[PDB]
């Protein structure tokens, strides 16, 4: 189709004239996001621009992964790829990428930040990232960095995840990451869950850690220092040196730190936010948990068709990555 050019704060913008009235809206991973309404199809939509998508083997590599998880989530809880284009005519003269997706409205950052939710409004917030998640670690995909700022919600609670397998933050992480154990599993983004979810019912982050000795120390206060099980598993001299260091804490009365709380709710926290990550639920357990008892519906949770990372593990040519990329963008086939 026929492109249109624009500046919008400091950035140029070359998109197809079927986008219309662009305004900004904020950053996004590696790129800026303009609103726009598409006259194709009549939705209102998020535009990203990657920044400097090509300008290393990191970057390359990068927007090649982005592209690939987009192209590849088609589910209602997480943001999926309406449209992928460049302004660029061949792949010599390609070196942009602009991602289409529906336009949400708000954050959970914006949601949360003072305004208090009902007990309601969280089994439902809460029920559908964990929806989302079933179907991203299905693909064999973490998002490892889930929080608040990456939960898109509109103005009747539907919610997406977005920015996952990109891979403070700090707040929401597994105490294993902040441990930097390489061997870490799906279920961090389940810790994130809890930490998300004990926020929307309290009103306040639940570890507010300053640093990661910080953050370490908040975490093992509310859940206690590792028991014995969990001490073995852990090769680390260094680690173990500090964790077994530490004045020894007891595991917490959750019922007593979340008094108040749905008592539904606080079982679930305490599932979720296991220091052992080996005893914490998975997001296929946890919709199946009570408290979405009005919303779980087992025929209505789909899984992800399987999704090829192999790339992740290749050394390639910025070339290579840059022409990989291409042949995406011109594969790419939208939805119905
Ligand atoms: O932090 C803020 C605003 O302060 N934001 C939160 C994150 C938000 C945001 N980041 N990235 C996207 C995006 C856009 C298109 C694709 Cl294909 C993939 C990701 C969005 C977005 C924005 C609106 N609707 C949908 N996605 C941008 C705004
Ligand atoms: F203070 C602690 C100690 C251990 C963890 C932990 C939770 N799940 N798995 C681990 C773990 C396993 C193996 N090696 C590691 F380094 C960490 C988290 C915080």
Redesign the pocket.
């Known amino acids: 189709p026929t492109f249109y050019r624009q500046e919008l704060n400091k950035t140029i913008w070359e998109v197809p004239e079927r986008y219309q009235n662009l305004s900004p809206?904020?950053?996004?991973?590696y790129?800026s996001?303009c609103?726009a309404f598409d006259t194709k199809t009549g939705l209102r939509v998020?535009?990203?621009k990657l920044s400097r998508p090509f300008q290393s083997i990191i970057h390359a590599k990068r927007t090649y992964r982005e592209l690939r998880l987009?192209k590849h989530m088609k589910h209602e809880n997480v943001?999926g790829?309406?449209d992928?284009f460049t302004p660029a005519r061949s792949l010599e003269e390609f070196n942009d990428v602009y991602?289409?997706?529906?336009?949400?409205?708000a954050?959970l950052?914006?949601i949360v930040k003072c305004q208090k939710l009902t007990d309601d409004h969280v089994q439902f917030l809460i029920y559908q990232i964990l929806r989302g998640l079933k179907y991203i670690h299905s693909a064999d995909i973490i998002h490892r960095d889930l929080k608040p700022?990456?939960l898109?919600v509109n103005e009747d609670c539907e919610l997406?995840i977005?920015?996952f397998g990109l891979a403070a933050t700090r707040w929401y992480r597994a105490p294993e990451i902040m441990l930097n154990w390489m061997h870490y599993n799906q279920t961090v983004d389940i810790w994130s869950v809890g930490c998300i979810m004990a926020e929307l019912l309290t009103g306040r982050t639940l570890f507010p850690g300053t640093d990661h000795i910080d953050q370490l120390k908040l975490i093992l206060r509310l859940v206690g220092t590792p028991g014995a099980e969990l001490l073995k598993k852990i090769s680390s001299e260094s680690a173990r040196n500090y964790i077994q260091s530490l004045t020894q804490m007891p595991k917490m009365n959750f019922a007593n730190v979340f008094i108040g709380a749905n008592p539904l709710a606080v079982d679930l926290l305490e599932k979720m936010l296991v220091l052992d990550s080996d005893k914490r639920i998975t997001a296929a357990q946890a919709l199946a948990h009570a408290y979405f008892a009005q919303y779980h519906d087992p025929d209505d949770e789909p899984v992800a068709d399987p999704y090829d990372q192999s790339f992740e593990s290749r050394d390639l040519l910025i070339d290579e990555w840059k022409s990989l990329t291409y042949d995406e963008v011109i594969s790419f086939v939208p939805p119905p």
Request: without cysteine.
């Open positions: 809206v904020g950053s996004g991973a790129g996001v609103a998020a535009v990203k987009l943001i790829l309406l992928v991602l289409v997706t529906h336009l949400m409205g954050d950052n914006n700022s990456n898109a997406k977005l920015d």
